[PDB]
Amino acid sequence: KALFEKVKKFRTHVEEGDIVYRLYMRQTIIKVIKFALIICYTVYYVHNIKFDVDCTVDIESLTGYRTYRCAHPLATLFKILASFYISLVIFYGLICMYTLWWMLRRSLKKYSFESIREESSYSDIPDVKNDFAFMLHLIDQYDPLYSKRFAVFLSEVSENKLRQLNLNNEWTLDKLRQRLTKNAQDKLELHLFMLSGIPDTVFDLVELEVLKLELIPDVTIPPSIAQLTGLKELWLYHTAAKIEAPALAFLRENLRALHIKFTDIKEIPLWIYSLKTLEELHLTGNLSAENNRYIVIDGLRELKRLKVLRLKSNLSKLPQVVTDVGVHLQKLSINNEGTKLIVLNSLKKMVNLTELELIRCDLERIPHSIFSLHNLQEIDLKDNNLKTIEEIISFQHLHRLTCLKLWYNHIAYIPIQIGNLTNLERLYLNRNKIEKIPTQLFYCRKLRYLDLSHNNLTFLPADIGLLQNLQNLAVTANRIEALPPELFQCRKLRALHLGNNVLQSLPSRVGELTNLTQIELRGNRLECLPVELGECPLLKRSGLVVEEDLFSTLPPEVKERLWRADKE
Amino acid sequence: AFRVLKPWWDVFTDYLSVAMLMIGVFGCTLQVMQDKIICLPKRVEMKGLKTDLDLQQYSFINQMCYERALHWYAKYFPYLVLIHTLVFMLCSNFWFKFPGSSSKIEHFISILGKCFDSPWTTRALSEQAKALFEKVKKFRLHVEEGDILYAMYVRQTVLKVIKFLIIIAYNSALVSKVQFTVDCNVDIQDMTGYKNFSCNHTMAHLFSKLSFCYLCFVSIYGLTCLYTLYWLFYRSLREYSFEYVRQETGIDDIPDVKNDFAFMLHMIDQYDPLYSKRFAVFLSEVSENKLKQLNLNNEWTPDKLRQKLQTNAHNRLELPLIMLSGLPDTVFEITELQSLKLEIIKNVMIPATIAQLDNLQELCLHQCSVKIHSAALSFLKENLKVLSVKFDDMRELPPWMYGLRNLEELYLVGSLSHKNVTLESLRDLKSLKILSIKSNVSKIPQAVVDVSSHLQKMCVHNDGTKLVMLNNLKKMTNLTELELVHCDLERIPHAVFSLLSLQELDLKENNLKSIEEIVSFQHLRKLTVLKLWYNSIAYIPEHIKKLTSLERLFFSHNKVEVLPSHLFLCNKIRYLDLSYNDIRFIPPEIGVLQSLQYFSITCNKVESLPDELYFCKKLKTLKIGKNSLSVLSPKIGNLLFLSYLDIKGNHFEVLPPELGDCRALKRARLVVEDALFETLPSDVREQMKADA
Amino acid sequence: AFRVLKPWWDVFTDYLSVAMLMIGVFGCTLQVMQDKIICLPKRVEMKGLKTDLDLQQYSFINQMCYERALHWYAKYFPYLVLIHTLVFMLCSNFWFKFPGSSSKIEHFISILGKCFDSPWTTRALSEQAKALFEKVKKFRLHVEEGDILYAMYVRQTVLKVIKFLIIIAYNSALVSKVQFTVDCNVDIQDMTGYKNFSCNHTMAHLFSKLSFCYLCFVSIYGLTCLYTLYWLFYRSLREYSFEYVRQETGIDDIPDVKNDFAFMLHMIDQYDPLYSKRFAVFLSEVSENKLKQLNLNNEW
């Protein structure tokens, strides 16, 4: 890895330069021209070295003589030396001309580098620029193999493989074992997030039940995923991952749920339609397209075993393929999260549907097609800006109408037609502006759970004793200052969320709440806690949400038993 | 050590010096072997011209004319060149043969080579290096004070230039003086019979050519010297400014250097432009922070954090920090901590990893300059509910703490006024309910009025400063409990009278004496708690009877000499603190205090207690203290609810056994002398100590 | 071992000795090859002055007059320079060539290198060296009982200064004796018929200037030796108190050193003050206690 780092550093440093090439070219030019000059003038002047010379220095006042014949013994020897030296010069000049001609013909400012990568299929061996190609060519002149021995370290594939090896070395099965967690679904989860690649060791922990992937760059599933028997649900967040055929075959029968969170359409692998045991599918992100919307998801029809469906895509039209595949869907969830959706009457064709959730779809009204779903039992229409809900009378059609949610809306009044809807067992209409509770609401005696918090309600009708099946009610952030005695007539009331109201005093009949497990009184304008609150069998400090000062009004024995049950 | 200090001109000068040494030695050798003068007399079909002389006479004449006629510089040219080359070599090596500065040079070479050799520099630019960091700092502390090396190099270059100039200037004139031939008219006549002599020595013209070549070499030498000196007299090497490392790596450190470091760095850059880049990393402060953080993260273990994990004061899982240089990411792996305490930790940068600390509501900072990331700031804005901050000179205060809209409780320990409070606007603290400030604030800030629309409890406990402006405290509409300590007020303010929602009231260390404004405290019909701690109070008005809402009373450490009867009129008072006062007698009206559950008169002159004091059957805490009591009544056996009793330091003789009739009272809850407790029976003392 | 025992003046004296040795060799070579005395009878249109003498007579006259007339100092001067330079080199090397003190010198060099090489010294000033502490204390038990090394070095310095003084003293008087010309009267008459002879040898003036340069070098050597000897008898090298490690590092240990140890520390400080500082770490009792505490916390 440090070698790769130094390779990148050196490529940045020297690939630009083109300095050593220029200096060597200048030196070669100097050598060639100097050889030419000496081979010229030395051979010009070679003849002057002669054994016998004739000199007339004209010294007669000292000698009397004028002319002299003289002998230089080494002149033949110096002629031999000159011939030998100039032959050496000819050899040097031939070598230098060979070098310069080869350099000019070569054009070695860019290393071709394509033969080696073509032969070894190492496509990541780019041609390097000057001051790197020249030296590469020189080393090839010394030894071609040394080029390849460096080429593999300019190979990005090799660098990625080395990094993957280091990734596998780093991970220990124990760290993944401690990294295995339990979700809210009691499923062993190993969520891999911002991880470069797959370490195959994760395939040894077959106990993995849910795999969640986020910000993992385009990995490919190796066949060893076949060792992960317990995987049933999958979560992939923003990954255009690939797969292998054995992996696809294993997931074709060993996958139960799939969840995808994509920013772009391509982040969905196309082999998803080949998984035939998929039952729950979750998709997050804008899949909206123009003139080809709901066409990329056309393969859902191939997902015969698809039952559950969660959508978070800000859609405005119901997909055609989703409508066609809804024949075997038992639950459909859409979260347009602001975008208004038009059913186009295409929601009734999924008669097998049992649950339906449309949160923040800005419906503003109930289309009739919802009532056509005879198997529908629960329904949530949160943040659809619902002001008038008098259409509930058509809910007489649904004989298995178990629950309903219309919270986070503009509902300020309760239509009486809900009295027809006796099949209801739960209701949640909080975050609204409801001010009164009609007696007719108490005609749905099957009601068991309620959450009417954050409303203008200021009283509780005496007909609460009618709703004996009720066990949980929330009225937080309301104007409640009085509690009817009939509130205590439901002896099976388990837990209550009554905090943050204007309740002056709590009636002593709280002791009648024998099944009272959890109670919220924080924010109430209470002064003294009733002593009968301390006689409830299932009361605990955890189930007692109330301020300490108001709680201190309770008898000390009540406090001691509360703390003892807290420790036990 | 011996190669990295040599620029190109140094190498070229060294080569020229070697060539000049060869020239001088070869000239000396030729002078030794072949340099001889042949002499003949000058003045006189051709025939011989014999002068009838022998060979020894020839030799003597040659010696004499060589000594006389031959030019001295011509004879000494080889020695001259050798001497000058020796001087050049000696002065060129003397820079590194000078041990006093050569030690610094060698240390610089070692540190530069080690720093360039360190891979951590390459890692950071993208183990023991940290320890190596130490040496670098040591070096930059000791060697920046030098620069004598630079002056020495300047002196050496100047001397070399002067030598070259002199050599050229005089040898140019002296070269023409020599000739192949020569003549001498010495008084060899009458010793040989001849005076005029024509002579010559062979090596003359060859020496001339060699000298011309040597002078050209010295000319090139001087040109190199001039280039070097120009580069020395044009760049001002006294300071080296990087201005590229800061731009590239974004590290504003490595600001500059002294003269010596600049000289060495310039020489390194001339030798190689990248070794300086690799060397300056260990001088970088931010790189040093990166190395320290990495080493600390590797050294730290989450197990030690789990062990040091504890509960804070406000029952939250706290992870105190006492001395750290940064944030261990392992701390971010501990998501279960409900509190976090930082003490004396400067230069704190919180990344987005605070999102891991999901279950966090209280943060304790003690003398820490803490900066966040926008992601960390957002996570704290939506998750931080309690905050504890200690600052000393306001330099550790993070501005973003004023942007927390989910913050509920705030703790400050640090002066603001340093006369107005230097407080930023408390506008974004949209959930601030509790505010406790420890400062020396002079006037109450307007910023808290920006938060009083939902603020519930504001407290300022100064170190004795006198609170001047009471206008803002009148605006505390949503205030519920007010605590003012040591505010040097000396009088009851008009602002509290404008705070009707007050349920608790504190006037500790305010040194009040005349407290007759309880009529204006009847303006607070919710005044359940009112404190008058550490005051000069000695007088209780009748009108205190009008506060039926009173449920807790504090009058400890006051000048109250006699307590009045009307003081007992507020029956709803459950807590009574009359300790550390001048109270000697307890009026019997205390009998009406049936609901009174606390009564402390510790360190008073209490000499007797009426029986009606025992009529307070709900008294679960009784603290008489070191008073002047002499006897204890049996009636205290009727206090079946008494849990804590303190009568230590009194003059009791025998304690009545009826003390054992107090079921909730134990030996731990009873403060008596050894002899006092010994007066209790064996069964009573055993029941108080154990279950017998 | 062979490098850090040389202060700046020691290296200067080494260079001076090398120059003097080379000059003596050059003079000896010149004497061997070319040094010859030429002699002619002195007492006597201008023509030749033949004295009807042969070459054998020429050589014999040259021999006899060179043996007689030329100063013995002049003839032995290259040899004298060579001898004195050889004595200087021998006494320079003998300080380390005597095994009895050379063993202590080698042990000191090795222990100083090992101690300064230990990075725990830098750790304290900010592994196995703990055991090396024993050698340190063992070393402080052994060489501090010496100081005869100091006496030997003082003897060497005194002898070198004495040699320089004697060389200057008699060479100054002898320098003016050499002359280019000379005369000799021997009973070569009735052997050759002549008695008076004027003679000269070529080397004379060149050797005179050579002697001038040699005497200048001897003067420089004397100045260097004088500086060394003066420093020996001014700073009182028999005791060395650091007064810097104790003040800087805050360690009240390292009380003092003995004569030999003080002399060694003085010489090292002359070479480099910092090596002595890094070696003083292991003489520090506080540091040694800290290292023992660190080792004990590791081992426990």
Curated annotation (Swiss-Prot), chain A:
Membrane topology, record value: Multi-pass membrane protein
Cellular component per GO, a single term: monoatomic ion channel complex
Chief localization: membrane
Superkingdom of this protein's organism: Eukaryota
Residues on Extracellular side: 47-76
Molecular function GO terms recorded: cyclic-GMP-AMP transmembrane transporter activity; identical protein binding; volume-sensitive anion channel activity
Residue window of motif Di-leucine motif: 466-467
Effect of disrupting the coding gene: Increased prenatal and postnatal mortality, growth retardation, and multiple tissue abnormalities. B-cell development is slightly impaired, without affecting B-cell function. Mice however show a cell-autonomous early block in thymocyte development and impairs peripheral T-cell expansion and function. Conditional deletion in germ cells leads to abnormal sperm and male infertility: the cytoplasm of late spermatids appears swollen, preventing reduction of the cytoplasm during further development into spermatozoa.
Compartments reported by the entry: Cell membrane; Lysosome membrane
Key word Glycoprotein present: yes
Domain remark in the UniProt entry: The volume-regulated anion channel (VRAC) channel forms a trimer of dimers, with symmetry mismatch between the pore-forming domain and the cytosolic LRR repeats, a topology similar to gap junction proteins. The di-leucine motif is required for lysosomal localization.
Subunit structure: Heterohexamer; oligomerizes with other LRRC8 proteins (LRRC8B, LRRC8C, LRRC8D and/or LRRC8E) to form a heterohexamer. Can form homohexamers in vitro, but these have lower conductance than heterohexamers. In vivo, the subunit composition may depend primarily on expression levels, and heterooligomeric channels containing various proportions of the different LRRC8 proteins may coexist. Interact with GRB2. Interacts with NOX4; this interaction prevents the ubiquitin-mediated degradation of LRRC8A.
Protein family: Belongs to the LRRC8 family.
Function: Essential component of the volume-regulated anion channel (VRAC, also named VSOAC channel), an anion channel required to maintain a constant cell volume in response to extracellular or intracellular osmotic changes. The VRAC channel conducts iodide better than chloride and can also conduct organic osmolytes like taurine. Mediates efflux of amino acids, such as aspartate and glutamate, in response to osmotic stress.
Name of this protein: Volume-regulated anion channel subunit LRRC8A
Residues of the full protein shown: 241 to 808 of 810
From Swiss-Prot, chain B:
Membrane topology label: Multi-pass membrane protein
Expression tissues: Expressed at very low levels in adipose tissue.
Induction: Induced during the earliest stages of adipogenesis.
Gene3D superfamilies the UniProt entry points to: Ribonuclease Inhibitor
Reaction catalysed by this enzyme: chloride(in) = chloride(out); iodide(out) = iodide(in); taurine(out) = taurine(in); 2',3'-cGAMP(out) = 2',3'-cGAMP(in)
LRR repeats: 300-311, 312-334, 337-357, 358-379, 381-404, 406-425, 429-451, 454-474, 476-499, 501-523, 525-547, 548-570, 572-593, 594-616, 618-639, 640-662, 664-687
Subunit structure, interactors included: Heterohexamer; oligomerizes with other LRRC8 proteins (LRRC8A, LRRC8B, LRRC8D and/or LRRC8E) to form a heterohexamer. Homoheptamer; inactive, likely because it is not targeted to the plasma membrane in the absence of LRRC8A. In vivo, the subunit composition may depend primarily on expression levels, and heterooligomeric channels containing various proportions of the different LRRC8 proteins may coexist.
Protein name, per record: Volume-regulated anion channel subunit LRRC8C
Top-rank taxon, per record: Eukaryota
Alphabetical keyword list: Cell membrane, Disulfide bond, Endoplasmic reticulum, Ion channel, Ion transport, Leucine-rich repeat, Membrane, Phosphoprotein, Repeat, Transmembrane, Transmembrane helix, Transport
Chain's gene name: Lrrc8c
Family, as annotated: Belongs to the LRRC8 family.
Record's function text: Non-essential component of the volume-regulated anion channel (VRAC, also named VSOAC channel), an anion channel required to maintain a constant cell volume in response to extracellular or intracellular osmotic changes. The VRAC channel conducts iodide better than chloride and can also conduct organic osmolytes like taurine. Plays a redundant role in the efflux of amino acids, such as aspartate and glutamate, in response to osmotic stress.
UniProt domain comment: The volume-regulated anion channel (VRAC) channel forms a trimer of dimers, with symmetry mismatch between the pore-forming domain and the cytosolic LRR repeats, a topology similar to gap junction proteins.
Deletion phenotype: Mice do not show remarkable changes in body weight or the weight of white adipose tissue on a chow diet, but display significantly lower body weights and fat mass than wild-type mice when fed a high-fat diet. Moreover, improved insulin resistance induced by the high-fat diet is observed.
Signal sequence, renumbered to the chain: none
